Every structure is written in structure tokens, then in C-alpha cells.
Paper text:
Krossa and coworkers identified three binding sites for the amino groups of reaction components within the substrate-binding pocket. Assuming the amino groups of the reaction components to be protonated at neutral to slightly basic pH, the ‘innermost’ N atoms of PUT (N1) and of HSP (N01) mainly bind via a salt bridge to Glu210 and, in addition, via a hydrogen bond to Asn162 at the ‘inner amino site’. Following a similar approach to probe the role of BvHSS residue Glu210, the E210A, E210Q and E210K variants were examined and were found to be inactive. Superimposition of the variant structures onto the wild-type structure revealed nearly identical locations of all residues in the binding pocket, including the wild-type and variant residues Glu210 and Gln210. These findings convincingly demonstrate the indispensable need for a negative charge at position 210 to stabilize the positively charged amino groups of the reaction component at the ‘inner amino site’.
Numbering used by the authors:
A (entry chain A), B (entry chain B): 3 to 476
């Protein structure tokens, strides 16, 4: 009695079958009507092939590359009888090139990252600015300007980026009620941005604490994570990056901006997974997060930008990731950065290996009259196993967001290139919420200046606790 | 058939019965002749009392304080018939005051730290320099200038500080031998300092990797360590501190020297357990260490100082701790600094709780013709259980160093106030080595500039890989 939202008439082309593909396929089978034979999975690994064969789904063992993607994908996307859906959950592939190929062939598209073709993340000829997620996102915004409207393609619709955009909207609604701000619920981007401004939201952390842990301890010289190791390391070695709020009075000496684009970002000349920030979640209370670049750090700040008539930004929230991954991933980062090179091996924790834990993932809106408000999911591994197969709690928050994005795309298939900020947050959360466990809002009086200054002189701004100057760990 | 080294002809007063007192008591019983009733343990803890009652030893459940130490310890240490031994393995007590009391009453003395009376480490009216181990050590040096000679008192004779001073001497001898330099090894402090100078030793890391882990995972809001939690947190919140070599050409903007004293130190205006350095051990290979202040960072640099006729330092090595504690302690530090406060609870891992692991503890001499040489112990928990009770591998390296210092003090009882750098390193290692497991010397071509620069600008000195500029994580 799981809801079947729609029938999909055309081919369903899943690119990538790692941790998220494995968790998303069963949700697609559960929630859409289609002949199983219309699915096709593309992945270069033998591991993926054997799992796909165990599920009786068509499999092509190929890496999608710049050289082959047109000849490989166009026949799959256009096999008919109707509109196909490209579900892209891969690494090492260009999200922009594949999305544009889907659109010109009339196929819907969804992904969870603006990924580049293999070679980009470690290309020594690129300036740091060009390796930023701001720069990658700007290629998507340029593609939209060049071809407005047309077939829907949903960029960056996982848990974060993705779901957390919908949490920001729900949190703004809750804050407005709790603070007594009158007005109808916003229905346009400008109205959302004005509501954040009117509420006095100085900034937003994507504030996450993963407490899953395995039945075995972290092995030496093995990177351990609850989702893509390759993907986490790639974003962790990109510059630290944030949407930059109009309220900020200070940035570090090694911070840089952008000469062009939407104007909402800065980045630091240091890797994000070795950059710490002071943050807070309900279960962690005060904790360090890593300032890992994410698409939504830019997209949320951009979405909530208010401009004057000259086009100058007069309000924008700071927005960035404050990630505390699982303990073995924390150790894995200490080992990787401490050695100066990637470990020899890695592994992604399977639900059969996880003893207990939750993936606490939400948004921390701060600077308003009630100081700080966290809104999000506290999904446990135990609940995950009861309600969805083949994934851990991290995976289910992502796969269920892809499901919601797919439902929205089928119901709005002529919307052009869109981000999660552009979707109907209420419909998406209606689809996703059965998979999120406890979803709660919590206020706190904690601030980044709690307990400070201490035994040593610190470079703090005592006038405003939430300044990045107080959040960033030097 | 354990060797019995000496008769102790007077009371043995053990102050403190935590992890190190528990590991040292069986070695004292094993290796010294004395009537059982001569030994008494002083500790305020109920847990300690119960264990001592179980070991059949006299126990006085009392905190030693500035107000009571004279009335308590003078009668106990002078009970007769001859010279007693104060074995000080406590926290929250003044090493200097207890040492001076023991000496004025003719009792031998040993400790593993220059500890202050309770209140000092977190005193808000103290400048950071006054909280430094350099400053604490200078109180011992002044005591020795005021009362030269007299009864032997051994300051800071644990594993590190303590044993590592003997490892430095052995490593210097080994480096010379490996180069083909033959001849009488040094006998005076000047000759040792000139050996380091002549061999081109630029600096020394106390380079350690603890791999012990427990049968339960790290509990939330519990600090876990393999030795004193209180003591590790105390030194971890003291300023980062190092003996400062003559070859260094850069120091950070928040580094400071000292107006007075032996001249060998700098400190940083930040806590050492939240300061990382690039270092290396044989089992870890390249790793982060924490730059936690330690007595030997200053005492080894001081000992190996060569001065000119005017008294100015012409050569001195850099010397500092590069500590990678057990994984649960790494997580404990991330938790403590990330929350801004000490955890609600703590625990020290017992040998019965430890599944496997070693305490790899040695000295990394660098800058000489063979680049870098690590010399030290790789004692495993499995070997520990075979050879000594009531402790883990970390404890046994410490307790066996205390044993060695006790033998040396009984053999050289008229030497006055001394540090581990002043003892006969061969005799001390002769006593200690049965408890050290594999003791090895390993060369490596690794330097702090391995793999650097990466994809971000870095301030590095490529002319001199081992400069602190390149070691310090910035
Ligand atoms: N919330 C979010 O937005 C979010 C969360 C998790 C993951 N992600 C992203 O989702 C993607 C997948 O994550 P995951 O955990 O499943 O990763 P994963 O590492 O588990 O799996 C990635 C898969 O991609 C395949 N692959 C590699 N090269 C390929 C190519 N050229 N063509 C096709 N497939 C290729 C691999 O063989 C592998 O099976 C990653 O890009 C990741 O960063 C997003
Ligand atoms: N290699 C080294 O040099 C080295 C290594 C380990 C420990 N240390 C030092 O040795 C000492 C003991 O370490 P540990 O692991 O045994 O610590 P621990 O925390 O296990 O035990 C400390 C004990 O001191 C006792 N104590 C507290 N206040 C006291 C007082 N006023 N009088 C007497 N006893 C008191 C406590 O009850 C506790 O039992 C610490 O100072 C530590 O820093 C040195
Ligand atoms: N989300 C933004 N930053 N802008 C609005 C984009 C709307 C695309 N239809
Ligand atoms: N170890 C030194 N730094 N100096 C020599 C001290 C000698 C004490 N008898």
C-alpha cells in the first residue's frame, strides 16, 4: 500500500549504481508503474554488475565518458515509447553535458551534484576559483539562460544539496509564525527572499551529525564513510566555500570572491574537509563541522537574495555546510590529511555492518529574534531498515529526495533546468517525509561565542556572535 | 627470575594510584627488596582505595594539598630506619614543593611531570607564558641553583618526558656509528651537544602513535584515553610549546619567547592539543601529531645546546612533541574542542578492555645526512599482558621508566636535582628494556614537504624541508 505516484512510459536510464543508485532503484520500483525491462543501469564496476544482475535489471558495464556519452546515451534515452527519465547517480561524469543531452532528446533528468568529467577535480592547470562549486554551478545557470524552459532537468536534488532547500522554506514558515511575522506564505523567489530578510536571518548552516558506526573499528589505511568515499574526498579537496551574507563584516586573508556570476559566494584557498567551523545540531549540541563545499551553499544564498533596482544585492544570508560525518570518517580525514595522500583502500558502510546511529541532517537558521533554529531529519538506521532496503540512513535521505524530485519532474515536465530551491517544497516533502524519520524544529541559545574568549587571545567579533569571524576555526 | 636491583632501607610513599601508580606498584614489588609494610599509597579516590585494598597494600585516602603536605609527608618519609623513596605519580600536587620537602628530609624522589598545586592550569589571572612548561621547569632549575647537590631527586622520568631522553642519546650514537664515525662516545653534556651539532641534527620530534582500541566504541560525551584524562587535558590546554632550534628561520605571528631562563623555548598563543604538526613514525608513516607541551621539548633542546665563549647559543636543536594518541582520544579531542568544554565523563582504557594495538613511542632526529631516523619502542598490548600486570602498553612504558629512574637514584643517591637527560642512559635503558617490546631504529626519506605544494598556495621553505614553517599545520 505504498503510493504509486505515476506510470513512467519511457526508458529509465540510471547512470551509476553505487550506494545511492542501490538505494534509489527500489524506491523507483516501489513508487512508479513501469515494465521492469525498461530500466537500464550503466556502471563500469563488476560489483555494480553483479548487484544489478541479482535484481534482474538490464546492465551495461561501461564508464560514461566525454568521448562516448553521446553515442552511448542517445539510443537509451530515446528508446520510447514515451518520455524517458535519466537518473544520474554517478561520479566522474559531466552533469551539465548529460543533462543537456537529455533535454535535447526530450528526456527528464535528475542528479545530486554538479559533477565534472573525470580529470577536473585534480587538474593542476586550473585556478582554485575554477575548481569551485560556484564555478560549476555557473555552467548550469549559463545553460539555463541559453535554453530557457523546455524539458525539466533537476540539478542537485539529493539530501544536501536537495532536501535541505525544502527544509529552509519550512523553517522560514515556522520562524514567521513563532516570531509573529504576518503575510501570506511566499509563492515566488522574491517573496521567499523578502521573508528571510524580514525575519532577520543572518545566515544558515547545513548542520549535520552522522552517528552511524560499524561492527568493526576503522581499519588503518582505509577511508570509511556512509556514502561515496570518492565523492566525499573530491568535494573535501575542493576549496572551502560558502554563500556569503550581507551581514558579514570580515573574511579571512585567504578568502576570494568571483568577478562574474550570481555574486553570492566566496571561497577559501584551503581544502574544505580540513577547514573547521563552530556549529550545532540537536543531538550533537555544540560541535565542529567541516566547511566542505556544496551546491546549496551557493544556491540557497542566491535564491534568498534581495536586490535593489540597480541590481545590487541588499540582503543575502550566509549559507554553508557544517558537516560532522561519522566518527570513522572523522578519523579517515585526520589520516588522509595527516599522510598527505589518499588511503590505499576505502569502504562504504553497509546497513548490515552498522550497529546503530542516526543521520541528523537539517538547517540551522540564525541571527533572528530567537537566536537559532534547527529544522531537519533525525532518521535512524533502525527505522531505515524497516522502511527501505539496500541502504543506510545517509543513503535513504538521498534516495528519497531523488524520488521526490522525480515525482515533481513528472508532474512538472516542462519547467526547464531547475534546482531544488525552484521546486514546490510542500509536494517534495509530502513524497519524501515517509522516509525521513523524526523531522523536528528545535531552538537553541547556543552561539559561536559560547565560552569565549577563553585562556588564549582570540580574534573574535563580540558585537555579533554569528559572524563568520567567530564561526571559522583558525 | 626477575632481577632484584636494590634494597630500599626506608619507607616507600607512593603519591597517586591512577593508571601509572597501578602499573608502577607491581614493578616496585618485583624489583626491590623491602618489608611489605614499608610501602604506603596516598590517593583521595575511592576507586583507588578499593584496588589497593585488593592488592594488600597500605592506603591513605587523602588529597595532598598545600595546606597538609608537610604534616602528612614528613612523618611518612622519615619513618626509618634509613632512606625512603617518594614516588610521586599524582595530579593536582606541586612536584617542586614535594621534591624540596623530600630532599630536606633525606628521602629520594621521582616524578613524571612538573605538576603545580591544584588551581594553576585554569587560573584566569595567569598569562599564557606563566602556564607554560618552560616556566614550570624553570622553578626546578632555580631550586637546583639554590641548593646544588644533596639527595637525588629525579624530575620528569616517565616515558615522555623521561625515557625519550635516553632514546635521543642512543639515537645520536647510532647515527654516528651508521656514518662510520668511531671513537669514545660522549661523556659530558658538552660532548653530547657537540655530537648533535657535528652530526647536523636540526631537530627532534617526540614522535608517537598509540593504536590501542577498546572492545566498545567511543561513547558520546565521554573522553577516552589510555592514560590520565585529566592530565592529558591539562597539558593539551596549556600553550603549544617547543624547544627552538638555531636552524629555524620562521615562527608564527602568535609565537613568543621568554625573557628569562635557559633560553631554549618558544610557545604559541593557542592550545597544544588543538595544534597539529606533520610528523612520522614507522607504523604510522606520515601522520599528524598534536603539538602538546612537554618538559622534554625544553629539556632536550637545553641539554643539546652548544654555547660560545660569551654564553650565546651557537647550536640548539628544535625539539617538540608530535603526538598521535589512540583513535578514541583523537575523537575525544575533536569532541572537546568542538563543544568548547570538557566532556561530562571520562575513562581510561584498562588492559581488559583493549582488543589490540601498540604504543609506538620514539624520537625522530632529522636534518642530518640520512634525513630522518626514528628510534624507540613498539610495545604491544599483548606483550604487555605477558610481562607486567595492571596496565596497558602506554602505562608500562611509563612505569618501567619510573623503575629505571628509581634504580638510578638508589645507585646515585647524592646527585641532587636531575632530569632524565642527566642520568646514565645506558644503565637506565638496561633496566627498562625488558618492558619495552621491540626497540628499533628506522631511517626514512620522508620529509614534511612530501607531496607539497598541492593544489593550494602554501607558505613553504623548499630550501629546508624540516623548517617548522613546513611542519606546522597552518
Ligand atoms: N545529498 C546529496 O546531494 C548527495 C549525497 C550522496 C551522494 N551524492 C552524489 O551522488 C553520487 C553517487 O554517490 P554514491 O554514494 O552512490 O557514490 P559511490 O561511490 O558509491 O558510487 C559511484 C558509482 O559511480 C560509478 N562510476 C564511476 N565512473 C563512472 C562513469 N564514468 N560512468 C558511470 N558510472 C561511474 C562507480 O563505478 C560507482 O558504482 C556522487 O556524485 C555523490 O557525490 C550526493
Ligand atoms: N611519560 C610521562 O612522563 C607521563 C605519562 C603518563 C602520565 N604522566 C603523569 O603522571 C601522572 C599520573 O598519570 P595517571 O595516568 O596515573 O593519571 P590518573 O589520572 O590516572 O591518576 C591520577 C591520580 O592522582 C590522584 N590525585 C588527585 N589529586 C590528588 C592529590 N591531591 N593527592 C594525591 N593524589 C591525587 C587521583 O585520585 C588519581 O588517582 C599525571 O600527572 C600524568 O600527567 C606522565
Ligand atoms: N533559484 C534561483 N536562484 N533562481 C530562480 C530560477 C528559476 C528557474 N525557473
Ligand atoms: N641537563 C642540563 N640541562 N644541564 C645539566 C644539569 C646537571 C645537573 N647536575
Amino acid at each position: 500500500d505504498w503510493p504509486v505516484y505515476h506510470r513512467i512510459d519511457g526508458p529509465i536510464v540510471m547512470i551509476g549504481f553505487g550506494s545511492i543508485g542501490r538505494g534509489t532503484l527500489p524506491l523507483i520500483e516501489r513508487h512508479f508503474a513501469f515494465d521492469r525491462s525498461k530500466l537500464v543501469v550503466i556502471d563500469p564496476s563488476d560489483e555494480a554488475r553483479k548487484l544489478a544482475e541479482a535484481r534482474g535489471v538490464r546492465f551495461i558495464q561501461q564508464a560514461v565518458t566525454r568521448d562516448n556519452y553521446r553515442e552511448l546515451l542517445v539510443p537509451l534515452l530515446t528508446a520510447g515509447p514515451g518520455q524517458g527519465f535519466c537518473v544520474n547517480l554517478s561520479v566522474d561524469t559531466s552533469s551539465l553535458d548529460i543533462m543537456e543531452l537529455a533535454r535535447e532528446n526530450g528526456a527528464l533528468y535528475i542528479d545530486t551534484v554538479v559533477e565534472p568529467w573525470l580529470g577536473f577535480y585534480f587538474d593542476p592547470d586550473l585556478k582554485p576559483e575554477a575548481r569551485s562549486n560556484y564555478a560549476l554551478r555557473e555552467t548550469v545557470l549559463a545553460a539555463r539562460r541559453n535554453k530557457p524552459g523546455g524539458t525539466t532537468a533537476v540539478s542537485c536534488c539529493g539530501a544536501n544539496p536537495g532536501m535541505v532547500s525544502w527544509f529552509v522554506k519550512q523553517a522560514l514558515v515556522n520562524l514567521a509564525a513563532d516570531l509573529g511575522v504576518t503575510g501570506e506564505e511566499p509563492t515566488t523567489r522574491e517573496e521567499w527572499a523578502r521573508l528571510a530578510m524580514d525575519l532577520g536571518v543572518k545566515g544558515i548552516h547545513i548542520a549535520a551529525r552522522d552517528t552511524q558506526r560499524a561492527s568493526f573499528p576503522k581499519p588503518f589505511d582505509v577511508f570509511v564513510n556512509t556514502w561515496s568515499v570518492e565523492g566525499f574526498v573530491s568535494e573535501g579537496l575542493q576549496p572551502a566555500e560558502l554563500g556569503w551574507g550581507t551581514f558579514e563584516r570580515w573574511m579571512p586573508d585567504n578568502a576570494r570572491g568571483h568577478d562574474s556570476g550570481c555574486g553570492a559566494g566566496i571561497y577559501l584557498l584551503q581544502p574544505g574537509a580540513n577547514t573547521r567551523v563552530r556549529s550545532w545540531t540537536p543531538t550533537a549540541m555544540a560541535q565542529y563541522g567541516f566547511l566542505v563545499t556544496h551546491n546549496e551553499s551557493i544556491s540557497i544564498a542566491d535564491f534568498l537574495t534581495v536586490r535593489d533596482a540597480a541590481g545590487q544585492a541588499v540582503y543575502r544570508p550566509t549559507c554553508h555546510y557544517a558537516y560532522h560525518p561519522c566518527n570513522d570518517a572523522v578519523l579517515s580525514l585526520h589520516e588522509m590529511f595527516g599522510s598527505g595522500k589518499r588511503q590505499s583502500d576505502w569502504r562504504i558502510l553497509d546497513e548490515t555492518e552498522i550497529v546503530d546511529g542516526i543521520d541528523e541532517l537539517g538547517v540551522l537558521l540564525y541571527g533572528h529574534g530567537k537566536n537559532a533554529y534547527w529544522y531537519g531529519s533525525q532518521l535512524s538506521i533502525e527505522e531505515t531498515r524497516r522502511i527501505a532496503p539496500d541502504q543506510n540512513a545517509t543513503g535513504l535521505q538521498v534516495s528519497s529526495a531523488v524520488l521526490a524530485g522525480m515525482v515533481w519532474a513528472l508532474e512538472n515536465p516542462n519547467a526547464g533546468i531547475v534546482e531544488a530551491d525552484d521546486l514546490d517544497f510542500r509536494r517534495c516533502l509530502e513524497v519524501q517525509t515517509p522516509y525521513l524519520g523524526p523531522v523536528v524544529g528545535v531552538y537553541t541559545d547556543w552561539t559561536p561565542l559560547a565560552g569565549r574568549p577563553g585562556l588564549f587571545p582570540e580574534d573574535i567579533d563580540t558585537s555579533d556572535p554569528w559572524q563568520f569571524r567567530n564561526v571559522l576555526v583558525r
